[PDB]
Design a protein around this ligand. Structure first.
Ligand SMILES: CS(=O)(=O)Nc1ccc2c(c1)S(=O)(=O)C=C(c1c(O)c3cc(F)ccc3n(Cc3ccc(F)cc3)c1=O)N2
Ligand code: NI
Length: 557
């Protein structure tokens, strides 16, 4: 029962790979310690292969089957529809990997004849053949970190023609089913404002709260054939067209359960019997399987008044404390149960009695004060990786702009406002590119976003208080200051000074640019404008935001 078998062929790059931080004239204004930042490359793929390759053992008890029965009962209330070829085509990212069969992502989006023709042949084949393993490409992801060096993560995906077919069969299912089955525990339904409120209200709902995050070592590799057949049984509980059932069975047997791995040169690298990281059902599958195992493990452990929050493989549990000793015992049982279910821990779980000390979806709750002095909770994180990536994106154009996703998701934080907003608007001013739409990724989906829309986007996700926060916590101030020292980033007093300049320049231009100056940089000026609700921030179409997760799912909105 091995996650992978290997031939010995190497995982190969598609193009040249830089590992050292590229430097330009803008670099030093963000960060001086350039040797701290690196990107992963295929050169480390072998170490990752070793990490992700292990034997899985699975022992399944009555708690597991009881939870599954209840999930299936909820799944049976879902009705999902087939997407048409063109609906599915318009969900494809413009810079998605081209097909091996002589067509690309733009041909798919234009509904060109050769793309549409091939897609129909793949669909027909899915319907006739439920046995032949489908080919996947395996690649090393190039991602940017700060030192303490990780090996490249691996992405496994099928051909573009198959991906469009997955959308036809499954897009409506993976978008709709998770919230029906998990209700309030499904994380991807929440904007950042709604996530913080949920965590705080849950913490507050317990007489004596205790919470913990659970880190599964290599979740994707822990997913067994059983787990993936179990997901399919859940999907099949939905009210589906007969053609959708046949396609889902087929993709399950031929793709989701496993298949051969091919490098960028077309050589055979080996074989997969675990979760593929680049299929449509990666996020929904991981979410269902994480929630199933964790729910069953909560019962095994006898945790009292358990509330879970689940985003794929990321899990937080908040419950009633039974004292520090019985809590420690409960968590050992939880971890033994997950372990028997094929989800052993990386870092073993710790009981926490302070909400601010729990990290989940790479983020912790912290507290600041708005214009009225009233306390507001908001989500933050250690800004090291966000700033290392902004350093890279200062000297190189990248298809996805992490600085922009980070401003969107962490708008209330002191580091996003002072450093990220200041640095990148100054860059957009100097190049006259304020009006140019940029791509970023939120909950695995790709979005085209106009930066001049940032203030409306932020008021909607966070509320106006995001533009007025002050008096941040000492732990948060210390973590930021600590990151600025490590990376060699200029002090917050230098950023305030630049932000005054950026602000005044934005005000000069009027329109949406002036509104950015006013809302985004109100913190920079000695005596503040009283900010009021933005007119445009009621007209933005944020539908298709905070519905579901789509990690590796090749989704564009
Ligand atoms: C592979 S899996 O099994 O599905 N696991 C998985 C777990 C979490 C997660 C994703 C996948 S995602 O790929 O769907 C993107 C986010 C994810 C983002 O796309 C995101 C983007 C930003 F630009 C800034 C912060 C972000 N945060 C942190 C965050 C989450 C929620 C908040 F309210 C605020 C920050 C995320 O977790 N979360
Ligand atoms: Ni029972």
């Amino acid at each position: 029962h091995m996650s992978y078998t290997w031939t010995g062929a190497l995982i190969t790059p598609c193009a040249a790979e830089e590992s050292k931080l590229p430097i330009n004239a803008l670099s030093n204004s963000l960060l001086r310690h350039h040797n701290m930042v690196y990107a992963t490359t295929s050169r480390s793929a072998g170490l990752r292969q070793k990490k992700v390759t292990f034997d899985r053992l699975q022992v399944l008890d009555d708690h597991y089957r009881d939870v599954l029965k209840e999930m299936k009962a909820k799944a049976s209330t879902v009705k999902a529809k087939l997407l048409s070829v063109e609906e599915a085509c318009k969900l494809t990212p413009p810079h998605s990997a081209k097909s091996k069969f002589g067509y690309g992502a733009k041909d798919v989006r234009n509904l060109s004849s050769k793309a549409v023709n091939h897609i129909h042949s793949v669909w027909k084949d899915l319907l006739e053949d439920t046995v032949t393993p489908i080919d996947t490409t395996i690649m090393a992801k190039n991602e940017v970190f700060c030192v303490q060096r990780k090996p490249a993560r691996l992405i496994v995906f099928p051909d573009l023609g198959v991906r469009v077919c997955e959308k036809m069969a499954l897009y409506d299912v993976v978008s709709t089913l998770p919230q029906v089955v998990m209700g309030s525990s499904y994380g991807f339904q929440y904007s950042p404002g709604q996530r913080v409120e949920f965590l705080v209200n849950t913490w507050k709902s317990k007489k004596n709260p205790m919470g913990f995050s659970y880190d599964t070592r290599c979740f994707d590799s822990t997913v067994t054939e059983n787990d993936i057949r179990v997901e399919e049984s859940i999907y099949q509980c939905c009210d589906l067209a007969p053609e959708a059932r046949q396609a889902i069975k087929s993709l399950t047997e031929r793709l989701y359960i496993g298949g051969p791995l091919t490098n960028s040169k077309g050589q055979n690298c080996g074989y997969r019997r675990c979760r593929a990281s680049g299929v449509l059902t990666t996020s929904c599958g991981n979410t269902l399987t994480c929630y199933l195992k964790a729910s069953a493990a909560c019962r095994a452990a006898k945790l009292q008044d358990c509330t879970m929050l689940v985003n794929g493989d990321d899990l937080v549990v908040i419950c009633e404390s039974a004292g520090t000793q019985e809590d420690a015992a409960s968590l050992r049982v939880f971890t033994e149960a997950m372990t028997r279910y094929s989800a052993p821990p990386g870092d073993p779980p710790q009981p926490e009695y302070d909400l601010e000390l729990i990290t989940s979806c790479s983020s912790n709750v912290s507290v600041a004060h708005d214009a009225s002095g009233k306390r507001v909770y908001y989500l933050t994180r250690d800004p090291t990786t966000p700033l290392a990536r902004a350093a890279w994106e200062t000297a190189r154009h990248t298809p996805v702009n992490s600085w922009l996703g980070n401003i969107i998701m962490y708008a209330p934080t002191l580091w996003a406002r002072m450093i990220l907003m200041t640095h990148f608007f100054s860059i957009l001013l100097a190049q006259e590119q304020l009006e140019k739409a940029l791509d970023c990724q939120i909950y695995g989906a790709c979005y085209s976003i106009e930066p001049l829309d940032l203030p409306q986007i932020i008021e909607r996700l966070h509320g106006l208080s995001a533009f007025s926060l002050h008096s941040y916590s000492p732990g948060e101030i210390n973590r930021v200051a600590s990151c600025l020292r490590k990376l060699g980033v200029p002090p917050l007093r230098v950023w305030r000074h630049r932000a005054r300049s950026v602000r005044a320049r934005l005000l000069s231009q009027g329109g949406r640019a002036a509104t950015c100056g006013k809302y985004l940089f109100n913190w920079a000026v000695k005596t503040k404008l009283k900010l009021t609700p933005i007119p445009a921030a009621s007209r933005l179409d944020l539908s298709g935001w905070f519905v579901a997760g789509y990690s590796g799912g090749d989704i564009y909105h």
